[PDB]
Amino acid sequence: QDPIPSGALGQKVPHVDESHQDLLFRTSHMVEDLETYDEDSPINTSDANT
Amino acid sequence: MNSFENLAQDVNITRSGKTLIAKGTGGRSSRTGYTATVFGANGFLGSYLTAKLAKHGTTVVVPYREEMAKRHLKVTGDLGVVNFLEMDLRNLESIDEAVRHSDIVVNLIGREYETKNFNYYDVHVEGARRIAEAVKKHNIARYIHVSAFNAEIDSPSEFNHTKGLGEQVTKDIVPWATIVRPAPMFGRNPVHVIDVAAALERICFDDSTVAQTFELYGPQKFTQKQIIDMVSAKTFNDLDLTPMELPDLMFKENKEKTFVHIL
Numbered sequence: 001q002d003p004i005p006s007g008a009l010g011q012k013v014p015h016v017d018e019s020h021q022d023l024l025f026r027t028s029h030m031v032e033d034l035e036t037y038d039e040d041s042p043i044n045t046s047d048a049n050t
Numbered sequence: 051m052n053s054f055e056n057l058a059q060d061v062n063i064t065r066s067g068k069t070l071i072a073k074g075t076g077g078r079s080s081r082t083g084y085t086a087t088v089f090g091a092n093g094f095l096g097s098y099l100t101a102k103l104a105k106h107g108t109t110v111v112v113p114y115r116e117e118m119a120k121r122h123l124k125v126t127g128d129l130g131v132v133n134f135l136e137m138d139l140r141n142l143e144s145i146d147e148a149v150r151h152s153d154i155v156v157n158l159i160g161r162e163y164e165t166k167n168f169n170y171y172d173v174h175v176e177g178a179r180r181i182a183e184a185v186k187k188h189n190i191a192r193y194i195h196v197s198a199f200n201a202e203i204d205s206p207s208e209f210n211h212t213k214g215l216g217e218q219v220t221k222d223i224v225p226w227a228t229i230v231r232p233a234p235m236f237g238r239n240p241v242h243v244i245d246v247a248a249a250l251e252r253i254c255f256d257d258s259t260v261a262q263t264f265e266l267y268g269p270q271k272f273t274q275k276q277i278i279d280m281v282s283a284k285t286f287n288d289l290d291l292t293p294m295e296l297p298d299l300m301f302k303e304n305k306e307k308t309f310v311h312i313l
């Protein structure tokens with residue numbers, strides 16, 4: 001419940017909520033870290049291989 | 051039910067005086083009453099020709115040279131419609147026999163190369179002289195001689211020269227014969243082949259096409275480079291036909307995640 005999350009330096013880091021795994025947020029180019037949108041969320045799989 | 055879109059009427063008289071009455075409605079089982087002899091019906095234009103001609107019931111007399119090229123012409127007509135009898139251009143008696151009972155008769159005997167047996171002079175002017183002398187002998191009405199485009203009487207090419215020679219000889223011996231000159235042909239400017247056969251059947255049967263030379267050329271004129279890039283007198287308007295255009299004829303991630311693959 002904090003206003004500004006810190007990131008081991010004087011930086012702003014994203015507070016990863018449920019709202020970061022969307023079709024808009026899919027395929028935004030970025031380093032392997034500082035990134036959201038895991039490929040394996042229970043909301044992202046959407047009952048795959050059914 | 052099928053109608054005679056072939057004919058203009060039901061009772062027709064020919065020129066020689068024979069009375070011909072169409073029976074029933076147009077269709078495969080009926081008989082239009084005309085007897086037609088198509089020289090060269092094994093070939094590429096004659097196939098479409100007596101497809102249209104034996105469709106309604108004109109008794110088509112097919113003179114054949116080889117017994118195997120003629121077989122698919124059996125299924126285009128009813129019982130007794132298409133009739134096969136062998137002939138050779140050389141033997142007079144077979145030409146005499148093939149045009150005994152015909153009302154109309156056409157030749158499309160045309161060969162683009164010399165054989166060891168026939169040169170250009172032998173199949174175009176001289177064979178036509180032969181069979182059209184037989185047509186004059188029997189007084190057959192409506193003789194039609196299909197020729198080539200660029201048929202000049204005197205030309206560097208021997209093919210075109212002899213096509214002009216055949217035209218002049220058949221016009222000399224028979225005055226009532228009609229000679230039609232089509233364009234290049236593309237079945238499957240150039241003209242589509244069903245359009246040439248439709249034009250020829252509309253030549254076949256009406257009056258006031260007699261002793262008239264016809265030019266059958268398509269709508270728009272082409273060059274060979276344009277054609278390969280696409281792959282990669284009286285006209286049609288006499289007989290109420292519009293030929294088809296060559297260009298229109300020319301053709302003639304997530305889901306995979308939610309399917310199953312190893313079962």
Ligand SMILES: NC(=O)C1=CN([C@@H]2O[C@H](COP(=O)(O)OP(=O)(O)OC[C@H]3O[C@@H](n4cnc5c(N)ncnc54)[C@H](OP(=O)(O)O)[C@@H]3O)[C@@H](O)[C@H]2O)C=CC1
Binds near residue numbers: 090173234
């Ligand atoms: N681009 C084109 O196609 C053009 C063609 N034409 C002319 O239109 C007519 C038909 O067109 P096309 O389909 O190309 O021609 P064909 O392919 O139909 O010519 C072959 C037909 O004519 C017969 N033929 C040739 N020589 C003889 C011969 N000595 N004795 C018996 N039969 C012979 C052939 O007999 P067999 O069945 O045994 O082979 C065959 O039936 C031809 O006269 C042609 O000159 C006009 C302008 C251009």
